Design a protein around this ligand. Structure first.
Ligand SMILES: NC(=O)c1ccc[n+]([C@@H]2O[C@H](COP(=O)([O-])OP(=O)(O)OC[C@H]3O[C@@H](n4cnc5c(N)ncnc54)[C@H](O)[C@@H]3O)[C@@H](O)[C@H]2O)c1
Ligand SMILES: NC(=O)c1ccc[n+]([C@@H]2O[C@H](COP(=O)([O-])OP(=O)(O)OC[C@H]3O[C@@H](n4cnc5c(N)ncnc54)[C@H](O)[C@@H]3O)[C@@H](O)[C@H]2O)c1
Ligand SMILES: NC(=O)c1ccc[n+]([C@@H]2O[C@H](COP(=O)([O-])OP(=O)(O)OC[C@H]3O[C@@H](n4cnc5c(N)ncnc54)[C@H](O)[C@@H]3O)[C@@H](O)[C@H]2O)c1
Ligand SMILES: NC(=O)c1ccc[n+]([C@@H]2O[C@H](COP(=O)([O-])OP(=O)(O)OC[C@H]3O[C@@H](n4cnc5c(N)ncnc54)[C@H](O)[C@@H]3O)[C@@H](O)[C@H]2O)c1
Ligand SMILES: *c1nc2c(ncn2[C@@H]2O[C@H](COP(=O)(O)O)[C@@H](O)[C@H]2O)c(=O)[nH]1
Ligand SMILES: *c1nc2c(ncn2[C@@H]2O[C@H](COP(=O)(O)O)[C@@H](O)[C@H]2O)c(=O)[nH]1
Ligand SMILES: *c1nc2c(ncn2[C@@H]2O[C@H](COP(=O)(O)O)[C@@H](O)[C@H]2O)c(=O)[nH]1
Ligand SMILES: *c1nc2c(ncn2[C@@H]2O[C@H](COP(=O)(O)O)[C@@H](O)[C@H]2O)c(=O)[nH]1
Ligand SMILES: [K+]
Ligand SMILES: [K+]
Ligand SMILES: [K+]
Ligand SMILES: [K+]
Lengths: 362, 362, 362, 362
């Protein structure tokens, strides 16, 4: 019999690795961290100076956050939890608005992104957003291997292909990424359940660990040149370095940017400290059922520029350790799989911390 | 030599997996969660609309709980901690009893099951229960591979085989499932020690992880058309989805229904909060000795209908993710094996929950 | 290269399993738990009705504990931290002494054993103890593969081999067990580091997991018919069942008996709860340097007979589950390896225990 | 495909083991712990009586620590966070200064070492240190596979290779160790991330577990007779024994020596208990940016001699257990891999320690 039970060797397909299961192996390096080139292709036509994209969530990205992310070298994606006219107004506000790395189009204006669903109402929203000058559309769905999501992606590529870039929803397998690539998507977003606010892997018991999912999606997408975006489950800059090394071209950040000042919402004072609200788009409050997210609060951090600077410094240090001149070389790095004891050895241990580092906290 | 010690390669037969060791892999889907069919076979001749069955415990299932569970779309199994006359009276009360999914017999009365032991006194109890008009008998023992349990199953199926269905006791291996099938069981119940109130794996050191046990039992029960019931260890709707995807046709629930309003027992107030008593049938109090269970308390949950609806919504979401229109299709889904890091990535992390979700609580 | 580093495949010899890594598999059973025979061989000539032995520690075994253990069906081993005259007096007190299971010699006197070290002083102590009528001598060391221990075992076997039995020191490998058998020992004690009070694996970094060590030692001792004693690391009756199923013949208990009324020492009262002292023989206090043990307290348990009955009931339940009429049949049961999630499923989970079980506590 | 994902079997190159994943197997022994010889090679020409070195940290080693370590039988390495003239003054102070094991040169003067960076200013500091009477230069970096570090090592060996010994920076792979040996290093230091105060594996996500790294580096250094120094991650004397058995010849200590009276800094009182500062060299304060270390405090220990004696006693116990007369014989001991349960069993468990032992802390 099969060692794990039954007579079917393909019942348990594979062992899945996540960010905490692997470490990057140092290699022969001739690269100073300051000279590392952290530019990467977000889509087949858009290249960012910093490969970080803000999450399309109602407590993460709005006009201010989108403008700040575009100025810092990345991009912001406005959420679709607003009326269509309001979303178009936010797109116009971003496009209408020191920062040498800022992302700009052929007209010299900042780049913005918008998220739409699936359906005729979503089609009207997408048409309104495209008419307002949006550059990239995201078909933001929880299960992108559904036939409706693929049909919507094909429709958008057929209609507004010459003017915008269409990014498919979340996938976690090789077959889903291949289907999205065949459907005509310009970029594939990866991750089902690893988000810090998600309960999908608990409520439905469905998902896949992020590192293995990224590897599978890259094996499905790289021959066609389609970029891969790692979405959800990133907590440190080492996580971003690992996600890029596993094959992803861009990383989408949630809770790391929710505690910044540019994020929408009011500051909450609790017990002499500061926080702000963070919740999933599938949470009960956001969808007003069977929710697949939770509501919570993250500690307050400050300006987005400092956070992006620290994350980029960590990524530059990783590139220096691996000897990667560009991201295209960082994607050829190798991993070492570690156990739980190795995981606790990686973090600071046997020490009582008396002052916090800019890039680390418990 | 064997890597784990000794010269016998069969001393450590296999590596067992449980619910938290696996995740369900998304597949190509054309299924909407609202339009998925959750009906499944409880026995070879009885089909439920919601594949959930209440545990035969004195703190979980009685007349009220059996009626509520039959109305909700599943079934209840009355415990055998009562005198035979009282259990027969409970059966008659259930049979003497808005609800589109209610499970009914040919005459229009609600279905109900009843648990029996092993022996001549249990034989008299079984005859009384059959006379009172029960639909399915459960030979409720902790070890179904014993000779007495098989003899009792054969005797019951020869006596009242044409009238009621007989479900075999708890098994954890393929050989025991095959023995139950050969003895003439209409359904096989799986699980030895995974219950939240069990100490059998600690007191006796005997057991088997639930996912591996379900796979092993299904490998022997499926060829003969005998359904498999997964019993014990389920704490989320994702666990139910994983159990069904492993081959089981129905799931039997304990502590998940012990805190509802329909379960027997008075409310308990601790620090201003509500709880209800929950204890194993092998506990010292319940068996009144070497006990194999403990006595405890679980938080109050409210009406059973809300709990059943939340669990069924989670199962429907899992069916949508896997592209399974029917439970028979869900039983063909695949798994991915995860580590402890993947397990803590599955749950919400790096967040302080500010408001509790209807289907998730830490 | 080897996947764990280096070019030598024998550098990391094996993967070691302990009690928490394995579970007993149920088998076809015709055994009532009350009809199982728990008798087992302590040495090649001594048979115990209950296969449990007390540890030769100054906080566990003295004359009272030895008498109680012999009255319950097992045996006690007197510690050697006393002067030779006092130890001989304790042996005489035990021999000079309602209990149908009492283990007696031909003359109807309770059996007892004593511990000796290595050296000429140990030779004088051993001869004095043999004069006082001791029944079995334990060469109580921490490393039985040392030349001195084997030489001493050979000397004792040549001198007083017919009168008494000689038990070898603690081993952890197949080669050490083979050397002890060749030296002429009548029983082999297994375990290096798993003691609840030991720090040998942390201070010296030397040890082996108990299940793997037992399997390896049985691979060498069984062909010659030399019994195996599992010593250290046992916390539950399921652990005793696992140790006996792995191949061992008897289990030597430490902390499980230190909290009884018969153990030497006085009660300790702290915050309305009762404790008593427990310490290793390598501790700084016991050896009065680089200690290899610690000093602590364990909760009070009451009379030893109740504890012995609970452990025997757990063992009988395990034998009933595995279909083992005798311990010799229990030594052929199969294991299943479990993960950490399986381990947390094995214990009572997701519950708030209200009343204490006689054989379980968190 | 690869069971972890993708089509490249070399993406996840290997599985790394740390100190907590292995144990030393006992073997046939004719060695008394008090008669073992712990002398080991520091470099190709320097042999220490106690194979322990102090870290080049501004909170660990200064003149006093170097003198105490040289007297105790090891050696000290002065940190380079000081002005060049000040560090040369510390070197002269150490050279200008019961202890039968003290390490001395051919002129009866205490040995000492100093750390240098990479660059022309580092060249000036190195030349000043050589002219000031240093015995060994440690090219102290974080990534020694960089071209600059190899060039600096080659330049130092070409200039003052006949007067001083050059030890390369930290490596974690076989290729890096081979490159350092080819560059002309007298010794190779191993470890990237294991430090108790490091955050490199979190900020950059780059590193390797220590046991696998030591094995890989020894696989490249042993054929050429170049010693390997294990730096970082050692918390117990068992860790030192494991590192020596993996192939390392010496172990550099950080936090283990940062709480002694001879370490630089001042005593700190918190709730009646004594602590003192310990911070990483890449921490924010130490480099005064993206720090790769943290600042904290460790409990006060006392005189260095007692700590060194306890560590050497643990090492001698390990040598006695493995039957290793010399460190060269300890470097051939075998390992056994353990699980998380094995690690829990190795430490004291199910006990409430009431008095702290000299060599173990809870
Ligand atoms: N599912 C489990 O793992 C588990 C474990 C312990 C108790 N329980 C529950 O406790 C209640 C009583 O269980 P029970 O089986 O002890 O009832 P019981 O004492 O009435 O036993 C009935 C029959 O089961 C068999 N049996 C049970 N345990 C055995 C063992 N250890 N060895 C050999 N044969 C054995 C015997 O043939 C016995 O006559 C039931 O409600 C049961 O579901 C369940
Ligand atoms: N990434 C995740 O795993 C995840 C999980 C839950 C929610 N979310 C977020 O919540 C928001 C709403 O997501 P949504 O998908 O629930 O909204 P939605 O109702 O707009 O779903 C969009 C489409 O996704 C597909 N889909 C979604 N869930 C499915 C399921 N269970 N089975 C089959 N097809 C399914 C369907 O084709 C549907 O039309 C988005 O912002 C999304 O990113 C994400
Ligand atoms: N069972 C264990 O793992 C363990 C561990 C430490 C101590 N202890 C207990 O502590 C007491 C003293 O133990 P002890 O045996 O160390 O004391 P001891 O001084 O009586 O040692 C007796 C003999 O054991 C051998 N020995 C012990 N440790 C050795 C080592 N590290 N290397 C080589 N040979 C070694 C030597 O031959 C020595 O003569 C005993 O009661 C013993 O049971 C037990
Ligand atoms: N061993 C470790 O893992 C580690 C990590 C961080 C810091 N540290 C300690 O902090 C201090 C300063 O460390 P440092 O090496 O950054 O000092 P540094 O800034 O003086 O660097 C010296 C040389 O190391 C190399 N180097 C260091 N980090 C590199 C990277 N990320 N990518 C490429 N090359 C790199 C370069 O050749 C550089 O010129 C030292 O005392 C060092 O031991 C050690
Ligand atoms: C699950 N996932 C959800 C939900 N809303 C958004 N998301 C996903 O999480 C990502 C961010 O996760 P972090 O780990 O916090 O960075 C988002 O980009 C989105 O893909 C939800 O309700 N449940
Ligand atoms: C162990 N298992 C026991 C006992 N009484 C009942 N059971 C089993 O547990 C199931 C419920 O488990 P939950 O995890 O709480 O859902 C029951 O259906 C029954 O099979 C006992 O004393 N010990
Ligand atoms: C380590 N082991 C020690 C010491 N003294 C005795 N022992 C061993 O432990 C066994 C008891 O272990 P428990 O887990 O408490 O059952 C004893 O029988 C003996 O073999 C010591 O100082 N260090
Ligand atoms: C990471 N590692 C660092 C830093 N400064 C020094 N080190 C390394 O850590 C070792 C200390 O190890 P312990 O575990 O504390 O014994 C040092 O010897 C050095 O090699 C730093 O900022 N980050
Ligand atoms: K670390
Ligand atoms: K359990
Ligand atoms: K999650
Ligand atoms: K221990």
């Amino acid at each position: 019999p099969v060692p794990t039970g039954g007579d079917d060797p393909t019942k348990v397909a594979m062992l899945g690795l996540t960010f905490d299961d692997v470490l990057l192996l140092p290699a022969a390096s001739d690269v100073v961290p300051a000279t590392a080139d952290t530019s990467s292709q977000l889509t087949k036509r858009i290249r960012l100076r910093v490969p970080l994209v803000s999450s399309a969530m109602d407590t993460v990205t709005e006009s201010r956050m989108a403008i700040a992310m575009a100025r810092a070298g990345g991009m912001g994606v406005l959420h679709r939890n607003l009326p269509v006219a309001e979303q178009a107004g936010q797109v116009e506000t971003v496009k209408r608005s020191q920062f040498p790395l800022s992302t700009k189009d052929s007209d010299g204006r900042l780049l913005v992104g918008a998220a739409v669903g699936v359906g005729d109402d979503a089609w009207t929203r997408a048409m309104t957003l495209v008419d307002a000058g949006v550059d990239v559309l995201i078909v933001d769905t929880a299960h992108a291997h559904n036939r409706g999501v693929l049909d919507m992606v094909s429709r958008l590529k057929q209609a507004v292909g010459e003017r915008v870039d269409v990014v498919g929803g979340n996938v976690a397998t090789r077959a889903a990424a291949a289907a999205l690539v065949e459907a005509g998507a310009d970029a594939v977003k990866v991750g089902v359940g690893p988000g810090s606010i998600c309960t999908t892997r608990v409520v439905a018991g469905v998902g896949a660990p992020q590192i293995t999912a990224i590897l599978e999606a890259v094996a499905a997408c790289k021959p066609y040149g389609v970029p891969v975006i790692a979405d959800g489950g990133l907590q440190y800059s080492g996580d971003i370095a690992k996600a890029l090394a596993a094959g992803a071209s861009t990383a989408m950040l949630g809770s790391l940017l929710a505690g910044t000042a540019e994020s929408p919402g009011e500051l909450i004072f609790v017990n002499g400290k500061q926080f702000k609200s963070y919740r999933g788009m599938g949470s009960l409050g956001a969808m007003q059922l069977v929710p697949e997210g939770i509501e919570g609060r993250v500690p307050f951090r400050g300006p987005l520029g400092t956070v992006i600077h620290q994350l980029t410094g960590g990524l530059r240090a990783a590139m220096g350790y691996t000897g990667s001149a560009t991201i295209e070389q960082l994607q050829q790095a190798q991993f070492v799989q570690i156990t739980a004891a190795g995981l606790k050895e990686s973090h600071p241990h046997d020490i009582t911390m008396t002052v916090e580092a800019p890039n680390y906290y418990t």
